[PDB]
Write an enzyme that holds these catalytic residues in place. Structure first.
Site: not given
Ligand SMILES: CCNC(=O)c1ccc(Nc2nccc(N3C[C@@H]4C[C@H]3CN4C(=O)CC#N)n2)cc1
Length: 290
Positions: A20-21, A42, A23, A135
């Site tokens: 969802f992000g 992030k 960096v 994850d």
């Protein structure tokens, strides 16, 4: 707690993009002089759903409170006016992930086991704080220096409810299935033991030097095939239940493969905990060192 002001933030390059992000690397220079700091920021996409937006504030709070030598250092937050949320500022880890590093640097078995031991210490600490990672893969393990590794992303990390022994997931489209235990694929239940299965997969990635042709999606997709319709996940689940596993990496010791196979027990309660793995890897590391 710490607040970063946008006016001293200079974007350098994108570092990665997760579930969802995103960096990015920034220079934080409150002057313009040489006392500059390099920071990893992030940001959640401005398009992200209300599910991910509530989950984002929870992730920020998770990193705000996790403090360990093998966990990336939280630096602060700054307003992401362009996305109406906040941006998460952390330390910049210059050597990147083991997934980025290992294919170009032939690292010895000894250092690889030290890394495996360090991931366990970081994960045993995370589990001690009643959080599941969800994850754990080599792409999320950052290399500080040739002798220090840190868990660098918490995008899917969740608080385990007090009374419960697991967290109910409800499977998405971006779930890292090739790192998941059968209980995750089948029952949509994530246990502390489910992170240990993912650690076994991470350990396999490390022993293959993160070779893209030996990767978990590559290997499992060779065992399943690609003409499956909506059935990749079903075939993966049935192969893992028949006892099929990722192969022994070339030059991987027999005892390390057996430990990997133990993190891959079909029955979750038969897996060791991260607390149990620490003395074992410590001891296996001391051996291959000499
Ligand atoms: C061209 C090859 N790249 C490299 O060699 C390289 C890559 C990263 C890097 N430094 C760095 N520092 C801090 C954090 C961090 N990341 C957090 C996670 C994992 C990585 C990207 N992530 C995400 O994107 C998560 C989302 N969303 N990466 C330095 C070099």
């Amino acid at each position: 707690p710490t607040v970063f002001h946008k006016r001293y933030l200079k974007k350098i390059r994108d570092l990665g993009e997760g579930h969802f992000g995103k960096v990015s690397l920034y220079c934080y220079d409150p002057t313009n002089d040489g006392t500059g700091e390099m920071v990893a920021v992030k940001a959640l996409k401005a398009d992200a759903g209300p599910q991910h937006r509530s989950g984002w504030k929870q992730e920020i709070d998770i990193l705000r409170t996790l403090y360990h030598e093998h966990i990336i250092k939280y630096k602060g937050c700054c307003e992401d006016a362009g996305a109406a949320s906040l941006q998460l500022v952390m330390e910049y880890v210059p050597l990147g992930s083991l997934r980025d590093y290992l294919p170009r640097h032939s690292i010895g078995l000894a250092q690889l086991l030290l890394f495996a031991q360090q991931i366990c210490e970081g994960m045993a600490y995370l589990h001690s704080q009643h959080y599941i990672h969800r994850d754990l893969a080599a792409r999320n393990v950052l290399l500080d220096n040739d002798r220090l590794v840190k868990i660098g992303d918490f995008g899917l990390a969740k608080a385990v409810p007090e009374g419960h022994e697991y967290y109910r997931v409800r499977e998405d489209g971006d779930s890292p299935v090739f790192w998941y235990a059968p209980e995750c694929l089948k029952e949509y239940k994530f246990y502390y033991a489910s992170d240990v299965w993912s650690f076994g997969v991470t350990l396999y990635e490390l022993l293959t030097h993160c070779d893209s042709s030996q990767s978990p999606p590559t290997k499992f997709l060779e065992l399943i095939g690609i003409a499956q319709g909506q059935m990749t996940v079903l075939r993966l689940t049935e192969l893992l239940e028949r006892g099929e596993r990722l192969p022994r990496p070339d030059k991987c010791p027999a005892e390390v493969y057996h430990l990997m196979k133990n993190c891959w027990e079909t029955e979750a309660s038969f897996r060791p905990t991260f607390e149990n793995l620490i003395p074992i890897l410590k001891t296996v590391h001391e051996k291959y060192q000499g």
